[PDB]
Symmetry: C5
Subunit: 272 residues, 5 copies
């Protein structure tokens, strides 16, 4: 079913704020792509893969936000008589456009964290495979669940509110599995890290946890506040979570990777 955004009329500022959020996020991710591309070579070869993954995540996020921006603009039009933006006839907005891109983002973010933790070769491949399986199952179950949010929001005609809960809970279990893999990786770093590096890797894990925990809250938003205000708040928290989880986490992880490159004698890392 269509997302809860399609069953509401929006005041000008509500709609304006949401479209600004999508534009801004797209700008953030394109600028982050430029930044990571310009700075990747400062990281040592053995960690550069994390810098490259950051670039990849920026590309994915830029496109996902840009398509949300496009769809948001196309799905609603101003109605002067009501003083509100209202659904257009032939288009329907979907918040699910972000979920399929998370298939790229989430595994990549976890993998780059494992990379900076120092895992290589088969250990790296195995942790990447576990993180991809868990993340993909989490995203797909949440993606199924998010198609029932008009039902769970009590919009007349729509049925299947229990599917929302069921698929959300299954996705939560897979989220816990990913968090357990990442905790094991951040606690068992390879390559003889310094105490500062160990603490920074732990902080990176906790930052990832805090930022990723926002997404289930936005998923549950139709249950709590199925209003225009709730939609605005949901888009705001998506914007905070997206920017933090991808760009800010990438910047922090790059700082950790640069510290490890410096501690291993990478001259560009040391001068920078």
């Amino acid at each position: 079913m269509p997302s809860i955004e399609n069953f509401l009329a929006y005041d000008f500022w509500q709609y304006d704020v949401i479209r600004h959020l999508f534009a801004f996020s797209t700008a953030v991710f394109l600028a982050g792509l430029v930044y990571f591309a310009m700075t990747a070579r400062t990281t040592a070869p053995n960690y550069r893969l994390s810098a490259n993954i950051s670039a990849v995540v920026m590309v994915s996020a830029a496109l996902e936000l840009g398509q949300l921006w496009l769809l948001w603009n196309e799905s609603f039009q101003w109605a002067e008589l009501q003083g509100s933006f209202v659904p257009v006839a032939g288009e329907r907005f979907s918040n699910g456009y972000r979920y399929m891109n998370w298939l790229i983002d989430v595994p990549m973010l976890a993998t780059q964290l494992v990379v900076v933790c120092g895992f290589v070769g088969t250990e790296l491949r195995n942790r990447w495979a576990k993180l991809t399986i868990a993340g993909v199952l989490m995203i797909l179950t949440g993606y199924v669940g998010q198609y029932f949010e008009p039902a769970v929001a009590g919009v007349p005609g729509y049925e299947g509110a229990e599917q929302f809960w069921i698929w959300g809970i299954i996705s939560t279990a897979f989220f816990v599995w990913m968090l357990l893999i990442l905790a094991n990786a951040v606690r068992n770093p390879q390559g003889a890290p310094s105490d500062e590096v160990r603490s920074r890797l732990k902080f990176c894990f906790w930052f990832l946890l805090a930022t990723w925990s926002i997404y289930p809250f936005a998923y549950a938003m139709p249950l709590f506040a199925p209003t225009a205000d709730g939609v605005v708040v949901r888009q705001v928290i998506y914007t905070v979570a997206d920017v933090s989880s991808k760009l800010v986490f990438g910047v922090i992880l790059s700082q950790v990777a640069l510290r490890r490159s410096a501690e291993e004698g990478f001259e560009p890392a040391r001068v920078a």
Copy 2:
């Protein structure tokens, strides 16, 4: 004739999922282009051509999926009364937009496999020529066959279902010729490869065989499930095949090429 996608009405989730699949694949291929471009120079000069071909394939795939996404959005519109996305009056969706880009993708993928296998000069040129001839004939025959899809699906007023079978079978024969060439290349690697390299090249051949085999199934889908559910499944399998056979195959092949560069003494490959 118009593809079977034009003769069905879509529930919101079906149409939504297909548009998300096209957007997601476009994002995957643009991010893959960025990745390959940033990492190509880690491969030794004598294998860098494969890394370059990967970049080329990403470009081709990005545009082919983006045009699919555009056309999908333009060809259908929401209908509130029916609660379904229905075909628009002036536009018709086509699934054949992917076929012509395969003219780039398929020879390039096979070629880069032959490259990493160590064939150079005239031996390389001869394998590239054979792979291009076989692949172009395969793609063109399947392309002709895919225009009789509504006829083979039993849509009234459409004739020529036998053409679907005939051109699909001819394309299958050319596919077998491609596979035979690639098997001879993966079994006769040049440049004195290590046992690990040989096994990884064989795995690459089998991965290509497995991922390319999804395309004839997707081609056959109008026969087995000419429904909206069958269309969704078709697009999902295309997404899996596209992502695997281009991006994941490129990553695996870059790993083999990097290992061969390391074993030949390429220092960037060895440090990385």
Copy 3:
């Protein structure tokens, strides 16, 4: 509420000038992105972050202006009978689209100034954190205030003119806090700068203060000139401020950074 631009009819030259301004600013920022990307590596590694932040700012600004240009074109249409561009029925223009991109621009600009001042590590992080907090609060308060501009302009049916003043004043206080932080950074440069560097850093502070001060005037324009002429002058001052405070400030700051790099023995900086 919709910005004051939506409540006026525009002569051809007024509308034409505004759309030319948006397009020209977009061109300026894309060209600046190309320039800074091509020139970043001339700055020494310990100051290259400023060159990178300039690239980031150019990206942000390019998209912010391009989206304003798109919206401006979409929100109004020619009406030959009146000889004027008038609001279209289904779209409303918003000047607030620039405000969310300022979230990127303003902290980045301040930070790159602090970088060229020579602050590193935790001192850098702390100043970046203060400048981001102050700038985000400033931008968000001004963004809230700018939604009441038809009310402050005396357009009938719109209430809440006092919110315009209140949020503008709060934003002014946060602006003063940012200016104080930047004055402390520019007055306490690190790394033993030369007298010429010290004076150029002070000039960069005053240039930032002068260019940033145009934004509150543009914010106040609905109060003084809620006409088509006032809209034109607003957009002209916005263009001047955008170009100066981002591109010209980046060029001047790159010159200071290059001078510091030369002083510290960076050979690319010295030859250039």
Copy 4:
């Protein structure tokens, strides 16, 4: 006058094929741009200009095909009752959008061939000048002639069929002049080329002659087959000629330039 494409109704497969051709060629040329930009530095500096020109040609061709694709999509719409794509009311397709871009492509292609032939300095400038004059006159005369193709095709109400022949013949004379310059350049290479280089340069000249000769046939198609089938054949041969004469010719010329760089001692060329 409008091109002959505007006076026909198209079956779905005819229209579909043509749009696929334009999109495919655009993808080819963008991929080619990525490839040439990634590989230009492998050529020695005294031949790198040809690699740069290949990149330029790719850019030009990509845009020329993308605009043809756009216009083709806009100029026609599906009509379900007739089962055909028919011209829209407000738009007309033009095949002349390619001709103006040839002003870039044709001189550049000839010039890069002269470059790889070894001509430098004033001799290079003189051959570039002659090739540009001849090619520009060729393109402009053919461009004038192509505006009379509805007349030459016998579409009622259109006069001036003799202009088609006259301007085509004048363009053919200028084509012969260009071929004569290129033949003299490839028969008198500079810089003491090896026999393989000499033969490969002669091959490149004959390849250019073969691929460029398709364009007058496509120009003459309105005369022989002013039908939808003839339109499809025209676009197909344009696609073959475009791809060959730009991309494949560039690849082959890069191979010659690489061989000459290896024979003059350019290490990157020798390792690759």
Copy 5:
């Protein structure tokens, strides 16, 4: 007032040629961007600023022509009954869209000429400042003047023909001031240039003078030939002037800069 292009009906070839010119120029400038970006590092660091300015000019020109192309397509539509492209109801074309981008182009072009003349530091800054002031005043006065071209063309209901003359004459005076500055720079080159460099710098001055002089003629076209043929010829001379004054001028200037770099011992310049 709307440009004279809005008050005429266009034959198919006239409208077709104009849209081809806009597209072709956009392609030229994007290809120029790619060329200058790929070749900038061949110039020595003390002259590489000119190469960077060429890249910047390409960006600006590409966007300006692209927007003229877009606006041209949107402002007119085919009318089968009249056999002509006629103005659409809700859009009006503006030739002034190039003027604001000239704010970037003209100072940059003059400045890069002064750079290759060898002026550095404060002397360079002073000449850049004079050139920017004169050029901005020139462009703004001509921009004001070009808003009266329907009046000067004698279209009924439009007054103010004298403003066209007045602002054109003031802009001509500022053009003369620019030319005087550039003549002083080209006649007093720094860095002890060779006689060949001195003569090539003088030729660059005369080439700039010849190509820039076309713009006042195009500005005067509404007075001489306010017809569809006059519009076509104006766009043609705009295309010639744009290509020559930006791309061709950049190529010639890069040749002078390369010769100076080689004379000063820049090895990449000498090998290339």
